[PDB]
Design a protein around this ligand. Structure first.
Ligand SMILES: COC(=O)c1c(O)cccc1OCCCCNC(=O)[C@H](Cc1ccc(OC(C(=O)O)C(=O)O)cc1)NC(=O)OC(C)(C)C
Length: 282
């Protein structure tokens, strides 16, 4: 019972301690490509890089680099590509990835501007009649429809490979109410957002892995994938109470560094899993 464990940590207020043990035991792998001088401008943060072994490679002989990682959860039967919010110069690369990896959905957990500064580039068109064209990767992106709700907006986008004139519908799931500081008060809306993504089919195996990002693509994005996998496991296993969130998180960190950036996010993840389990279950 993780809800029982949850209350213990809370009782003895030891979230920092537990979160810190996870950090200590977290995997550490080479990030050689990420650090090559030529890729300096392809990284938003100096301390956030994809491990070489799990990085997404762009299909181009020029420079195949993009700060993104493939998180592959074998037992859960789910995969996710966690990436940083694209930069002014990596938007074409961002959509190239979405096309090459055959992704059906893009999940955004932040706003273009937060705490007064840019956390992500405006990488999608905001008006139907103003399509965007990425000359470097030869891609055309068109806003098809938009549905603004209280805590999130879902957009329908048409992505076209100008080289082949092939097209695909991409669903943009944008969680718009994540606080500038700290974590959400209640996992309620965050969970419904996740379920809406599940419902679209974007997380299903018939499609490439969903692309997820916040600013660095490790904190909020971490919370999203950790909660989704844990719920899914509790759904699969003969004994749902055997799902250990701390171990699942560590398995994920084998594919990308720093998933879950604070003890607050860790507690929030527990909170979301526990709440989502109560609904999904009974
Ligand atoms: C806590 O650290 C870790 O867990 C960790 C680890 O265990 C092992 C390896 C790396 C690790 O983590 C690496 C990052 C440690 C803390 N670094 C920072 O805050 C920033 C980059 C950053 C920005 C926003 C964010 O998240 C937001 C978002 O995207 O909006 C969100 O989730 O809300 C996450 C990371 N770097 C920075 O200022 O440059 C410097 C510090 C160089 C000046």
């Amino acid at each position: 019972e993780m809800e029982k464990e949850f209350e213990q940590i809370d009782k003895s207020g030891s979230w920092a301690a537990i979160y810190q043990d996870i950090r200590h035991e977290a995997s550490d792998f080479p990030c050689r490509v990420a650090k090559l001088p030529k890729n300096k401008n392809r990284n938003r943060y100096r301390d956030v890089s994809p491990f070489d072994h799990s990085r997404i490679k762009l299909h181009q002989e020029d420079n195949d680099y993009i700060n993104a990682s493939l998180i592959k959860m074998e037992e859960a039967q789910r995969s996710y590509i966690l990436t940083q919010g694209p930069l002014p110069n990596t938007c074409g690369h961002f959509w190239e990835m979405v096309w090459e990896q055959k992704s059906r959905g893009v999940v955004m957990l932040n706003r273009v501007m937060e705490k007064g500064s840019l956390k992500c580039a405006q990488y999608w068109p905001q008006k139907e009649e103003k399509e965007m064209i990425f000359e470097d990767t030869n891609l055309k992106l068109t806003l098809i429809s938009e549905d603004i709700k209280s805590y999130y907006t879902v957009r329908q986008l048409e992505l076209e490979n100008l080289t082949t004139q092939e097209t695909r519908e991409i669903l943009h799931f944008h969680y718009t109410t994540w606080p500038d500081f700290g974590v959400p008060e209640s996992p309620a809306s965050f969970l419904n957002f996740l379920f809406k993504v599940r419902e679209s089919g974007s997380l299903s195996p018939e499609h490439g892995p969903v692309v997820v990002h916040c600013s660095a693509g490790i904190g909020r994005s971490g919370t999203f994938c950790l909660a989704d996998t844990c719920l899914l496991l509790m759904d699969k296993r003969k004994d749902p109470s055997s799902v250990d969130i701390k171990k699942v998180l560590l398995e994920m960190r084998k594919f990308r560094m720093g998933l879950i950036q604070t003890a607050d996010q860790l507690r929030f993840s527990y909170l979301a899993v526990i709440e989502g389990a109560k609904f999904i279950m009974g």
